[PDB]
Amino acid sequence: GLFGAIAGFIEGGWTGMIDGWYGYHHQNEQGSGYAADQKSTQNAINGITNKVNTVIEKMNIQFTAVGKEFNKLEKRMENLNKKVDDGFLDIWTYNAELLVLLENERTLDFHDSNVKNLYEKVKSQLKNNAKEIGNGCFEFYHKCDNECMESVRNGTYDYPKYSEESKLNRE
Amino acid sequence: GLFGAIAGFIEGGWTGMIDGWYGYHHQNEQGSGYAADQKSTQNAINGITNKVNTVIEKMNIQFTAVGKEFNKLEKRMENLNKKVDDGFLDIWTYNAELLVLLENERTLDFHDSNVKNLYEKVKSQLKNNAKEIGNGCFEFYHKCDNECMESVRNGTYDYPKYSEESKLNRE
Amino acid sequence: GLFGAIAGFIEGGWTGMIDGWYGYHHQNEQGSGYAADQKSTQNAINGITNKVNTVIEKMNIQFTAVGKEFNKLEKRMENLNKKVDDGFLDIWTYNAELLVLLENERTLDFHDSNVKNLYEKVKSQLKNNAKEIGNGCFEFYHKCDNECMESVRNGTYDYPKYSEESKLNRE
Amino acid sequence: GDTICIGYHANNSTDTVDTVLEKNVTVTHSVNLLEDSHNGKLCRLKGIAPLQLGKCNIAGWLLGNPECDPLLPVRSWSYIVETPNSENGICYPGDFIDYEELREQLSSVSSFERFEIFPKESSWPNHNTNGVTAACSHEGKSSFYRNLLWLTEKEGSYPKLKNSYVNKKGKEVLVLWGIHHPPNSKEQQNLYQNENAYVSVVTSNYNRRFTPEIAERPKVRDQAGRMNYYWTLLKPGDTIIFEANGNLIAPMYAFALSRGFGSGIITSNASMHECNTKCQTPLGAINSSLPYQNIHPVTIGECPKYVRSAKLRMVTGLRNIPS
Amino acid sequence: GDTICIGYHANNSTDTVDTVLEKNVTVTHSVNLLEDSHNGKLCRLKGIAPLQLGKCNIAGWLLGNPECDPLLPVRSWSYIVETPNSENGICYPGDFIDYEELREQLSSVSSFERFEIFPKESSWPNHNTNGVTAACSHEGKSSFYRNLLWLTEKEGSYPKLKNSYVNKKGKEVLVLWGIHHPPNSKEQQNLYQNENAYVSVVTSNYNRRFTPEIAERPKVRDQAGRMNYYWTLLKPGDTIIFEANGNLIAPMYAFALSRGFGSGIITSNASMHECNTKCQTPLGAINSSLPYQNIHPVTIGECPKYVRSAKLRMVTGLRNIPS
Amino acid sequence: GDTICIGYHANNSTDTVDTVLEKNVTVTHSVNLLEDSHNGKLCRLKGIAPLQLGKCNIAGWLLGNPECDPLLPVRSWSYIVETPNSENGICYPGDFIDYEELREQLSSVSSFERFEIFPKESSWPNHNTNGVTAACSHEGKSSFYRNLLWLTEKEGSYPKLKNSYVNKKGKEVLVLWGIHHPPNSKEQQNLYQNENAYVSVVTSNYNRRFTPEIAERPKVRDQAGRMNYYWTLLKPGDTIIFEANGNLIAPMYAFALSRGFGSGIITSNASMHECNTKCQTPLGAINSSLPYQNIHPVTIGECPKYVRSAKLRMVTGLRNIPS
Numbered sequence A, B, C: 001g002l003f004g005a006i007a008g009f010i011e012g013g014w015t016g017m018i019d020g021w022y023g024y025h026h027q028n029e030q031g032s033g034y035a036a037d038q039k040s041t042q043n044a045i046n047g048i049t050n051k052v053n054t055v056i057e058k059m060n061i062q063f064t065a066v067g068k069e070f071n072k073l074e075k076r077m078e079n080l081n082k083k084v085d086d087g088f089l090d091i092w093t094y095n096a097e098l099l100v101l102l103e104n105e106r107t108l109d110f111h112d113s114n115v116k117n118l119y120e121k122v123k124s125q126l127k128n129n130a131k132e133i134g135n136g137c138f139e140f141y142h143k144c145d146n147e148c149m150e151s152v153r154n155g156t157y158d159y160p161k162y163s164e165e166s167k168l169n170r171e
Numbered sequence D, E, F: 001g002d003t004i005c006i007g008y009h010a011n012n013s014t015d016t017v018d019t020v021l022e023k024n025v026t027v028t029h030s031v032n033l034l035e036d037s038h039n040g041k042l043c044r045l046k047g048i049a050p051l052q053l054g055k056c057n058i059a060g061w062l063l064g065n066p067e068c069d070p071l072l073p074v075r076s077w078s079y080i081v082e083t084p085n086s087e088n089g090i091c092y093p094g095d096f097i098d099y100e101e102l103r104e105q106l107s108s109v110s111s112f113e114r115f116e117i118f119p120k121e122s123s124w125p126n127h128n129t130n131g132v133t134a135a136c137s138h139e140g141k142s143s144f145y146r147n148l149l150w151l152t153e154k155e156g157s158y159p160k161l162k163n164s165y166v167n168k169k170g171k172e173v174l175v176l177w178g179i180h181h182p183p184n185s186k187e188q189q190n191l192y193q194n195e196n197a198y199v200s201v202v203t204s205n206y207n208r209r210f211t212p213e214i215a216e217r218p219k220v221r222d223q224a225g226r227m228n229y230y231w232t233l234l235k236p237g238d239t240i241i242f243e244a245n246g247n248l249i250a251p252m253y254a255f256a257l258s259r260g261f262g263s264g265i266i267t268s269n270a271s272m273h274e275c276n277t278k279c280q281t282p283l284g285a286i287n288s289s290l291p292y293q294n295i296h297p298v299t300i301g302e303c304p305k306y307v308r309s310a311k312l313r314m315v316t317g318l319r320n321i322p323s
Ligand SMILES: *[C@@H]1O[C@H](CO)[C@@H](O[C@@H]2O[C@H](CO)[C@@H](O[C@@H]3O[C@H](CO)[C@@H](O)[C@H](O)[C@@H]3O)[C@H](O)[C@H]2NC(C)=O)[C@H](O)[C@H]1NC(C)=O
Pocket: D014, D016, D024, D026
């Protein structure tokens, strides 16, 4: 994708993560598990829901549109009516197909952006208390229990608390 | 935003910075102050001015367009004329609303991109002579006077000049 | 550009690199040379080829469209026909110009994204076995022969193999 | 050591969309915007049943061709249904003047009252009213339009007749009448007694004089003669006057018209069911809030916009990579 | 230690825009593209004042209904203004043939010269020219169109008349005339003396013969008779010939037409002021370089494109976060 | 120490495109979508040569004005070419009824057979067939339409004539005829002997009676008289009957019509060459798979969409920075 996260440095998705589009997988002494990031997920749902509603909202209700009839001496008017009908149909078909292709491109890019932003947000919180090990994973230089894991997940990670232990481990 | 800078890792704007869209706030021994980045600001103004002018330029002048009249035995032609008028109005309204929504999205994303690019440009200039302290701020490991501050602001920062002092301070 | 790589931190293009849009220039004991990245280049060609074909595909063949004639007592119908013809022409001209401008913007941004992603992919492979020296260049802290250069170029670089020598050189 | 990873959702979804850069992209979640499904039935529109002309077309219905099942004296509808094999139309050959304009008028009509404008046994004294023709046959016997009356000579005389009706219905009244053009001068004398006959029709906003044209025409439905059909809408409060000394096919029944919005004429092979819809097409009713449809360009009511597209699916979720 | 921060502008701006992903986004800077403001006045267009028909409509103006303030003999305009209550129209009841086509013709007319094509006291010898009617009353007295002349029998005879005018104006000349249809044969003899009268009109590219139709019509403006109105555009250098032996409402005044671009007919309740605009609507003049407007679909001159949108505001600045 | 750099392609390309943010951007690779190139020739369309009317227009061709080079008795075409200086049109002055509708009909015609519907020396006994006029001159001598016949009195009598043709061609047959309107009553008697002449024409779906109008008209091509021209399409199996006692310009040749798709009438100053195209314009043929063109809005065949754009170039490569 445009931001290099989805089908990029993070090769694959998690079927194990069923509660949101984006989130975290952790492994520590206490065990392992997945948890969706509710904030980034909910924001994304609101945006995409607004985008879908906007597309539907712009196409106004169609009111009664029916054929007209013309006698053998009104061939020009018949062809004019057909020209008008065909012209409008050509335009709406063009508009519909192009809008969906563009919004689809923008949507996939939007998800890619959201995933990269979540990774960088985690990266900047952890700083040098962990190492980047590829595939969007961090390996801690200190012991990180479920409380520690929750502090990263909910954006309140305490760098100084583990800075000494991490420094010792990093050597 | 799409690039995670505006309303992202940089939470808020500066009402104090009145001379451009993007720029710098500094604090050193000599004092503190704001200064807009003229290069990135002017480039952005030119782009957005081109974008606005392009949108206006594409809508050609409307020339005289008035109602027509039809007698009691030309009801089909009257409805055809109405169909044409309503059809064109539906299309232009659709086109106008969609163009403005898309360009608005692209504009907000463009500003977000410009801000992130300015941060990364500063980051890459300073290297390890300063630490990232969040909220788009750097804290120097050396003394940085107004001359030093100007060299970063105008893109001529001299890493080797302060590399020893920074190394000593970083320990 | 939107991603800050092209005409950004990488100031200029390489006329020397004739086999792809993106790739590598290396300098080691054995000599120097350019090589295009075939994977990122081919993917980009497929995308852009799909984009061009999509634009052409959406404009359906025009079938016979010719003038009509009206006598001195059908002036309204003549003006209606002209209104229809002018209306459709206004719309298609608007649609064509806007589609090309938007796709052009998206295309330049797409290339910028592809270049930045290739740089970050190299950056994350090398880690601290090399230093970022600006202008999209890395300077190795170890000896890197043509085999080493190929491993980075084809994405199989072996960090541990040179980690000791690099550490020694970095001091 | 302990690890934490950032990642994204995948599932067993097989839905695909297209983008500008790429075709056939598998995504976790998406929404169809293109309605393709209808029930294949004719339904009521917003409570009101349609008017089914059955074996008749508009011409057959309004003239009252005997072959078509007589509709109630008062009816209302949301739209009008003709069938493709509308064989019972005009039964006596000739031209229907401004037929297409009359159809366009009827397309904004919401109801009618069929009423006796000129009672048969009173309206046309000293004239014959029993005139029938094999071109308009019913139950094997020669017959005639239920809404018109063939006036002919009586006891060898056709006295000049003059009749008017005053529109006290408080709605537009559609009046229909005919002008007969015998193939030769001997039939003209036999039927109307007067070689130089005329017909005149007059209202506040209508005036036309009709003169018969005698000539040997090709046989159509075994008739060398012709019948031209004319109509007008008599405004509320206005008077219509018929003056004739021959060749007049007199109005007998007329229609008090009510105007509606969102009506129209469609052709359909579909059958009426006890169902209700907001959107009717000639193939079937649509029950959808989707913005687009590829079912039919002909729509009655509040419908999605018709497009030629085979697929319109918007991605909402992510590129699906469950590997 | 010393610090440097990267940041972005904020201010006290309350302007909002919509995007695809989000509604009601507050931004530091933006531009309105949708013009909603007009001055509520009729103005000149590019220097030229409009033609105000006042109490008349096009039919009333060109026939010269006596109720309408006589306009100058020579006029020019940028557009034509009728009012919604155009009560003074056709004053003597009947049909105006190709009225809508004539309006369409006038929509590309930039000026006229009103001139005496057939001087009253010379043009029609041995005929009465004093004919007036209560249907076209002026100052309580029976009167007639200022541009037409009611020719009737004189001393019990209506001699066949034949007159032609040669167009030496070097511009198209619009000629108007009428055909009277008495309600009965006794009026016909009284007025024109000849039961079998005809009228013919001929030019290089126009030929039509008119025959009166006698019949008792419903009273309209207290008249059972009818008057049909006809027109043609006589090409520069061409000749028009009128031949009649009765029932002819003769042309008296005609119009030398100049063609313009960008003219049209509008209906407006607004009043003329001493102002000038590039863009006029029926509600008022627009003074704007903005590409769109939601004021009115009817435009004269060089106007923004009409759209139904309530708001069209483009963001130029940034998401405003002054917190 | 050893180095590796990431970079992007540059070359000597000078191609420029526009974007939303920026104009005149130099790029390494791009594609033109706007076709501006034609060969300036008239060519065949999908194998079939066009019908070149040359000195004639549609009116001149179908009536058979003597000035126009007689075309083969059987022809087929992909489109129809008139020239701007079509001076040879209607040669005897009058009106061509429903000319524009007839052109619209011909626009869906793919071929014709010119055949003798009414042989000159057999079709009209006891009438003169030698009538010619200086208005339709050929080789300096007075002549007449090749497809019509001027019937006039013979030996001081014009007997009532009645003729019919039965359409056994298995295609629509276009029949043309005329009605002559002498300027005065003395010419009428001289030419047709009967002051009160009529003409009637009848088919299964056509009926019209024609009466001459005598009046002194302005001289056109030195003629004060007029000739009106009428046409009908006789359906396969149907019969056309002409009945007249004067003033009839009889059909002599008619056209068996074949229907095609994708035909039309264009005006062109260009010359026919031995070339073949899928797309023809009045300026020249287009040989292009490009989606857009700015050459001409008039197109025959399978053409790019016409637009007003001066340039439509899509970038494929990168911003070109060879510095
Ligand atoms: C759009 O993408 C989908 C997803 O890849 C395509 O569906 C897939 O179609 C291929 C057809 O070659 C399937 O391959 C076959 O699989 C069977 C076993 O399932 C194997 O025995 C055959 O030898 C063959 O390789 C593939 O399974 C299938 N994938 C899924 C998930 O259904 C689809 O064809 C693409 N459409 C277009 C128009 O490109």
